[PDB]
Each structure stands twice: as structure tokens, then as C-alpha cells.
Symmetry: D2
Subunit: 225 residues, 4 copies
Amino acid sequence: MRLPILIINFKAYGEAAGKRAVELAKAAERAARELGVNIVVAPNHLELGLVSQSVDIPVYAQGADVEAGGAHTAHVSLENIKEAGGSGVILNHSEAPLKLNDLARLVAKAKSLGLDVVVCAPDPRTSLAAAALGPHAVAVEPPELIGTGRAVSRYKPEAIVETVGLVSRHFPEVSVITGAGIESGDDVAAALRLGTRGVLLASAAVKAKDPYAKIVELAKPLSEL
Amino acid sequence: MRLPILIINFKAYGEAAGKRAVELAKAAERAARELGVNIVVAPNHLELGLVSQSVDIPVYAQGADVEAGGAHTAHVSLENIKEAGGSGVILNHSEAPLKLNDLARLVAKAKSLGLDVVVCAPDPRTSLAAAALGPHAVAVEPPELIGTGRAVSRYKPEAIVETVGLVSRHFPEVSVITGAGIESGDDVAAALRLGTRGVLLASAAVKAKDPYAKIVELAKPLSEL
Amino acid sequence: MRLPILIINFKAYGEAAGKRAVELAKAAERAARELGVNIVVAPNHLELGLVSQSVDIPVYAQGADVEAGGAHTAHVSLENIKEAGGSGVILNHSEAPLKLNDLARLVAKAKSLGLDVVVCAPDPRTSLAAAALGPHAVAVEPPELIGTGRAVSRYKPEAIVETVGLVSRHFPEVSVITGAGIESGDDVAAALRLGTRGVLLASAAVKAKDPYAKIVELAKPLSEL
Amino acid sequence: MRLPILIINFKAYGEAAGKRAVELAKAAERAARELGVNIVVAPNHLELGLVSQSVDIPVYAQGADVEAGGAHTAHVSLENIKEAGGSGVILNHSEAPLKLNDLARLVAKAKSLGLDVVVCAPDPRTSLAAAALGPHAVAVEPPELIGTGRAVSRYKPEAIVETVGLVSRHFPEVSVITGAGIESGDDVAAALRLGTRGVLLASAAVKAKDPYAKIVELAKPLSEL
């Protein structure tokens, strides 16, 4: 994955479903080109293939629960993600927690497929544990802040700082990014100043009246540091 | 939902992933128009939106685990399915079993959103319980026969018989379909002769050397009725 | 199981854990003998064997997730419940919802072991589905009321009436009991009056200052009606 | 927990159910006393309280899924384990895999409660992630060898060696034990020579014609190292 990163998680919001998924991805794409910043998009599963074939910025799956293709009705396999045009996958988001054993296999398989992999974790210690699995990045996100507009970088900076320290002490190839409550460019800059290599967010971009303008605001700090 | 139905479940097979999903859906669409039969397609989650916007036959989701849109990363909600262009959803398939309590809620919700709903069950009794929830159809599918090419209509016709009997006795409005091991048109005709209103299959169509031809073979019994 | 029944679910309350489990079961036993009423007790899993060997009233398991003994670390199997001295099992309580497919197998297996089986469901329609599986009894239990003191028989009598009517119309062998919010002898009598053959409760008994006295109050209507 | 340890997991075997749980625990206790070795026992949930009150060797729960007592019908909470007389708990056994996020909270809660905690993992990398959470010990256990009689220490020594290396490299305060396939005193000795501080086994002890004799055989190497 490209260095400083901004990941827009569409979750299952109606504002980003159906065609809106492609519109949102395109606004993200324009912002990435205007700023020369790596902006990644994660649409809901139903739109992953469609979105992947509509934009050129990296498109990540919101999750996966199976390694290979096969008889896994209603499941999301890493191989299918690749075959659909995805460039990476987010695993263990607070809203879709995974079993430690599956997660370990999912991180390895995703990597051997050439997919970027980001593992979320609620706090520093769990982030350390996720980092031991070898993902490209670990996203520390305090679940209490998710959707509140109260940025982790301003309301709970210790969690970011402690994660960066723990991870850099044990598995320094693993990058740390953060999320939960990020709503403005300042929240993003604060994250980077705290040692982060990027940010993960949903609400602020997905629910903005002017997605392109908002995304530019949010991604701008990445093209400054 | 349309009267006699043939549902092709793409599962997570690589042979139906990516662009192949659209190709398979189109072959199904041709067959459907050629025979004047209701052929439905269920691509993997990642290609649902893409497939829905590429064909006019009904496109069903392989499953769902959430009712409404919102902060449900990596989940598939019924509203998102509707927003993606889907017309129905398969629930409780053997490879993705659901809690009875969630199942009762998903069925009702799906119905009010205007989604067709098919609930799978392993045997007659579980199928009877499923039918009590009120789905459009209940699909009796012996898990042992799945993917073996040993058609349920030939190897375990009692399972179809008892299900049609019980459901017609208790919840006559609910239609009964069946699946597992269906490999030929004769298997399909045998299933219909047992009182079924349709069939659910995967292998035979997904792995056929000539999808279109194979699907026509499989669907033909629906038109001959 | 015995005709009119009162089931005290200890859940995981500390007030009923350890030795307290035996103390509570004994107070229940005294009340049962004093009133000539079938009072059943359901301690947490950890105390099931201990309690079973300390009283003579029926002792039910709060749940199970596996049919037979074997390599199932940290699981509760129906055979083990029987070997431990239990006389029955509660399945699909709101706090431990089960997959429909598993629930069906568990009810059948439990009945074949000679165990009493009660299946909970949140509402009438789901209670009907549960009833189709053949348990001895279905316990309609509106989750909104659990632990609130607002008895189901006071605030949602319709739920009881409908469940009773639906079940008696489809599976008359299956009995209907009810639960959630039952706090007094009066809620109990109300329940019986509404067509119920018993009651399921936890808070009122488990948290009573005088268990024996409270249980006598709750069970008393079972001898009257 | 105590230095070199031998944990006998009763799983859900009928041979160790009901009264047999206490019999087995006592045979273990005798062996422990005769050898001056720390032999721990993990009975199925249903017999945990009973066994805890029948022996003085440490009794561990086979698993848990909840932190504190409360309205968690059919669940096993760490507080209830302590209230039942348990000395520790085993988490994430292959037969009961847990979510990383839950695992992190449970490990922390167990230690806070004064309970010993062991986390199982299928391989070195997962064991390393588990060790990041800080349990007293991690038990690398290849799932393919469980119940096969082919000892991990004979058939997959690399798995032990790698785990011991990785864990002592990152979290040296966390101990390593191993399990799966262990059937003889030689397999245990071989495990200890590979850097392990103990062993976890089930079949060999549970299904022995002479439990006491077998357990003495298995535990003997602990008195020699």
C-alpha cells in the first residue's frame, strides 16, 4: 500500500449504497488526483466489484471470512475479492470482530494474494496482537468514539501514542493508522502528528453534503506532511 | 417471486467470480428469455451490484445478516441489497446457517422491503419451522448431497416429499423448492414431479463447459410445465 | 415434564453462583414440597452437576450446543447434561440464541435422551416455528421485558394469547409457558389464566431478600388454578 | 500458576462426565501428591463446581465467553468460574475458537480476578499474537494432531520450537506449553526438552484403562526436569 493513507469506509450506509457507492468513490478519486494523496475506498460488499471497475484508486473490501473460492454461499473469500478487482481488505473492524485463529489465516492468505491488509483493533494491546499477525497496517479505533464526531486524535491520543510505541518496538514493518470520530482536517493532522501513517474514517465523508470538498479537506494534511 | 423458479447459486466459486459473474448471469438471462422461464441468479456478495446492473432477470443475494443500513462494516443488510439492485435473498443456506431469532426478523423485514425470500433447511422438520416464519419459499436441501452430483430428487426424494407434505399441511401459502446434487434436466423434472415449485442449484451450472446450453437443459422442465 | 411448571432460571447471576446455587435450589425444593407444585431449577452450567446432586426437584441446563459427548472443549452436550444428573434443558433463550439447524437437532436429540426440553422464542410467530420442532414446551418471552419487572402477562398478554392459539392450532402436543418481567404471584396467575401451563422467571427469585418466601409466593398460583 | 504444569482437559468425553469427573480428578490429585508435580484438571462446564469442591489441585474451566455475572443465560462468565471454585481458565481452544477482541478482554479480566489463564493457538504466529495479550501461558496445539495419538512433540516439533523462540523473543514473561496427540510419558519428556514449561492433554488420560497409573506415567517427566 502507498505510504501515507486515508481510507474511507462506506460501511453499510444508505448514503453510500447502490450508485452512490460509485459517486462517492469518484469524488474520492478526484480528491486523490488533485492532492497527489493515496485515498482508498471501502464500499459495502455488494458494491465492491462495481466500484472496483469504476475507479482507479485502490478499492478495499470491508472484510472477509473465507480464504479461497468454493462452496461458501453468502461468504466473502479473499480470492473472490481479488478476482472482483479489490486491492486490499480491512479485517476485524469493531462492527465485524473476527476469531483470532481465522484472522491469522486471513491475514496470511490476503498477503500472499497481493492484497493490502489492514487489521483494526479497539486498543493498544489488541493492536499489538493484531500486528503480530503481520498485516501491512493495524488501525487502532476506540469503538466508543466510532460515529461520535469526537476524534480519537483529540479525545483519546494516548491510545494512538501507545499503539505506535508498542508496534514499533515489536513489529516495526507494520504501520499504524487510526480511526473513530475523525471529522475534520485538523483531526487528521493531529493523528499524523501523533505518529500515525494515515487514517480510517466513515461518517464525515459518507454523510458530507459535498463529498469531494469534504474529502479534500480530510486528505489535505496527507499532502502536507 | 415468480411461480416456477430456477435459482443458480454462484456461491464463492472462482469460475463465477469477477467478470465471470456477469457472463454467467447473461447466459442465464438468455436461457430465461429463450424458454420463457423464471431463472434467477445469486452471485457472490462482491458482484451483486455489478450483476444486478448488467441483467434484467431477478438477482438474489446469497444471504444477509443485518436488516437496515448503518454502521455495519463488512455486513450485508437487506436495505443495501435492495439499494444494490437485488430482488431477493436466500437465507439459512447450509454453508451460512442463521439463528432462528435473526431469521424470523430478516424474513419479515425482507418481505416489507419488497424482496423475495427463500429460506433453506436441511430436512423436513427444519423446513417446516422455516415455513412458519412466512417466507415466499422454503428450500429443502440435504447437506450431504450438496456438490456431490447426487441429485436430491433421485437420492433422497423422501426429503422433498415429506417437506411438501408438511408445509402444504401447515403453511400452504409458502412454496417449496429443493436443491443439492441436481446435475441434469431429468433431476429437475424429478424434483418438480415430487411437488416442488422449483429448484436451487450451483455446481452443474457454474462448472459447465457450456453454461448457456447447460442452463437451458436444466430450465427446460420448467417450461415443459 | 410435570403438568403446571415454574422454572427458576439462575442465569449467570452472582447471587446464585457457587454455593448459592445449591442454597437457591434448596429453597426452591422446600417451596415445591410445601405446595405440591412442580418447581424446576436451572443453575449456571458450572453448578449444574453440583445442584443436580443436591436436590430432588428437576434440574434443567440453561442451554446446550452439542448433541453428544466427545472432543468438544468448553461446550455443553446433551448427553453430558444427562450424565451430570439434569432432567431437562432450556434452548434458545434470548441471551443464548441458537441457529435454527442446530436447534432442530438439539431438540430431537434431547427428547431421545429422555430430557425435558423447553425452547424460548421472542414472539408468537417465532414461538410457532420453535413449536414445529417438537419440544415439550415453548416459552414465549418478549425480550423487551426481561429483567424489567413489567410482567409479560400484564403488559403484553396478546403475545401469550396468540402464541397459545397458534401452537394449539398447529402442534397441540406442545405446551406453552411464558416469561419476562414476572415479579409476583399475581403475574404468575395472570399467565396461567391467559392459557399458559407454566412460567419462566429469574430476577424476582434470584434477587429476593427471602428466596423461599418469594418462591412460595410465585409458585402458589400453580396449586390454586 | 505453578512452574512446570500438566493440564488434563476432560473435554466433553462421557468417560469423564458425571461422577466420573470427580473420579478422574481424584486420580489426578493422587498422582500430583505422589509426584510433587502440579497436575491441573479441566472438567466439562457442568461438573466444574462439583469437581472444584472435591479436590485441592487447581481446577480450570475449559473456556468462558463472558467477563462478569449477570443476565447471560447459558454463558460461562469468569466471575462465576471463580465463584464456583475454579483456579483458572483455558481460552481459545481449537474446539472453541474466540474473537481476538473478546480474548483480549477475557485474558485481562481473568488476571484481574486472580485466575490463571492459558490461551491455546494452532501455530506459532497465532501463539505469538495470543502471547501479546499477556496470559500466564500460551499452548501451541496443532489441530490436526488432536485426538490422533500422534504427539506434537514427535510429529510437529518445529511448531513448539518456533513458538518458544518467538514468545521468549517478544513476551518472555509468558510461558509456553503445548498439546495434541500426547499419549506417553516420553511424549511429555520430549515436549519439555523442546523448551516447553508443561503440557495439555485429554485422550490419553481420559480414556486410559487405569487413569491413575497413566497420569503418573504422563506426569513423571515433570518431577525429573
